[PDB]
Amino acid sequence: RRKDTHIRELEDYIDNLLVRVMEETPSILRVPYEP
């Protein structure tokens, strides 16, 4: 019930984090991943 609410908090954390990752160091999202 509020398991759903933690889920979207997590998802939203991923999205806000990914925005910054995409803008600054997108290479880290490459499959497969080379430093």
């Binding site: 999205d15 803008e23 999202l29 499959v31």
Partner: protein
């Protein structure tokens, strides 16, 4: 090494086969028990078009009509889109009109778009006529192909055609 880098996004309903298309093209790998995509990732492959070597930079994310922080960065600088459906679930075809709109709303105006009916190996279970799908693609100014990420059927040619349409 490469002459052009083309960013191409994968789009369409969850479960249609987007990530396995990506893994088929970039790695020649397929996963039957693949789960829904958490987050955003991409993979690359170089092809020949004209004299030229083109790095295809292919982006993948979950198919979700909901707004996300990541949407604008996902379409940003994307020069082509693969809009995919599962030929064995008419619903995923029904939702195509909405993904087109998503591209109208978010992608560049000149984005080359290719409609892709995937899972063509599921021919017992076909729910989506090819001929109809193709009339729809022709009508909406779209490239069109059917594929099987599982077979490899037309997977290379899908990617070849959009990238040649981009070059």
């Amino acid at each position: 090494e490469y002459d052009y880098l083309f960013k191409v996004v994968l789009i369409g309903d969850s479960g249609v086969g987007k990530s396995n298309l990506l893994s088929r093209f970039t790695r020649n790998e397929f996963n039957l028990e693949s789960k829904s995509t958490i987050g955003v990732e991409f993979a690359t492959r170089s092809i020949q078009v004209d004299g030229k070597t083109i790095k295809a930079q292919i982006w993948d994310t979950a198919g979700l009509e909901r707004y996300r922080a990541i949407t604008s960065a996902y379409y940003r600088g994307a020069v082509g889109a693969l809009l995919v459906y599962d030929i064995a679930k008419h619903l995923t075809y029904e939702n195509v009109e909405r993904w087109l709109k998503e591209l109208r709303d978010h992608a560049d105006s000149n984005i080359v778009i290719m409609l892709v009916g995937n899972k063509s190996d599921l021919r017992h279970l076909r729910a989506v006529p090819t001929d109809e799908a193709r009339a729809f693609a022709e009508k909406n100014g779209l490239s069109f192909i059917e594929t099987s990420a599982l077979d490899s059927t037309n997977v290379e040619a899908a990617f070849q055609t959009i990238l040649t349409e981009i070059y």
